[PDB]
Structure 1
Amino acid sequence: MTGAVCPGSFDPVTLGHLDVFERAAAQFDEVIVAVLINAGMFTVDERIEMIRESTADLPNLRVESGQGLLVDFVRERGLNAIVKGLRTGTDFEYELQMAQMNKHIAGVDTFFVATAPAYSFVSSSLAKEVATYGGDVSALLPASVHQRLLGKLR
């Protein structure tokens, strides 16, 4: 009965995120993608849909929204592990501070894994920015997500 939570705002989910989801799904019996309710581009419902569409081939993964402390989200589902992806530009020092705080207040472990090099420079924010000015980010997002992004811009 192993399991981990993969947190984020995912506005929108990128192939970097999906790579991490797939690795978590391959190494834990159960994975929950935790979508933060927090001024963004997609609604929570749209963000969940896009992740669900992109993870249809991962039977042991589900997608849920949440608010407040991540460790409460994790513990209320009977788990005590977080899997977080690393990419170029991740503020790792801040992630370490939060990992140590999260272990202290709730006994939740955080496992970090590097995203694949091909997806190591995409972020939700940079993808939106580049797409806004007509840059081609189609190789960096799930095909579904890419078309919905184009819709939001145009």
Structure 2
Amino acid sequence: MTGAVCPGSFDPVTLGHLDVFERAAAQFDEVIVAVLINPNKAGMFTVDERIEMIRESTADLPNLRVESGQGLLVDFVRERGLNAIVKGLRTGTDFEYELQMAQMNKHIAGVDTFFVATAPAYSFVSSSLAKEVATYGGDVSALLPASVHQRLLGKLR
């Protein structure tokens, strides 16, 4: 009954995210990846595409499932009877903002946030920077799971 939610926009999911999912999956009895959607801001990928990319890359994790949602993250967490958020840290993370949100989320809902640093190899990739580099021809193939690289280049072209 131990469990955590891993939230984000995942547009697209990166190997930095995957690294965090795997560590969460190894340490909690269940993990729910929360694909949080802004209903007014279209991303590069649809919810279906975002969810499929994550599923294809997490198939070896039997205790991880993927769901989309919107609104307050702590409502998503508590609706599933959970009380924990696992958030990844990378180079360029706005950690001070993450801390402010962690304190806010604990205050309004009693939900705890656990931060874990992604591996050095995956520490400089982010969804936005990966899309930017790929838009101008840069090779980001080593920084994204296989379910993503193709689809990304397709969107761009």
- Bin of the TM-score, shorter chain as denominator length: over 0.9
Q: CA deviation at 1:40?
A: 1.0
Residue in structure 1 matched with residue 74 of structure 2 by the alignment: 71
User: How many residue pairs end up in the alignment?
Assistant: 154
Q: Which structure 2 segments of 5+ residues have no match? A: none
Partner Cα distance (2:49, 2:80) in 1: 23
TM-score (norm 1): 0.99
Give the stretch that moved more between structures: 31-40 or 66-75: 31-40
Residue in structure 2 matched with residue 43 of structure 1 by the alignment: 46
Partner Cα distance (1:40, 1:143) in 2: 20
> Could you give the per-residue CA deviations for residues 40-61 of structure 1, whole angstroms, max 9, x where no partner exists?
1000110000000000000000
% of aligned pairs identical? 99
Partner Cα distance (1:150, 1:22) in 2: 26
- Counterpart secondary structure, 1:85: strand
Partner Cα distance (2:121, 2:35) in 1: 24
Partner Cα distance (1:10, 1:23) in 2: 17
Partner Cα distance (2:68, 2:42) in 1: 16
> Could you give the per-residue CA deviations for residues 18-43 of structure 1, whole angstroms, max 9, x where no partner exists?
00000000000000000011531000
TM-score (norm 2): 0.97
Partner Cα distance (1:86, 1:61) in 2: 20
Partner Cα distance (2:100, 2:155) in 1: 35
2:97 to 94, 114, 123: 94
**Runs of 4+ more than 4 Å apart:** none
Q: Which structure 1 segments of 5+ residues have no match? A: none
Q: CA deviation at 1:144?
A: 1.6
Partner Cα distance (1:97, 1:143) in 2: 34
> Could you give the per-residue CA deviations for residues 73-115 of structure 1, whole angstroms, max 9, x where no partner exists?
0000000000000000000000000000000000000000000
Residue in structure 2 matched with residue 16 of structure 1 by the alignment: 16
Partner Cα distance (2:147, 2:51) in 1: 13
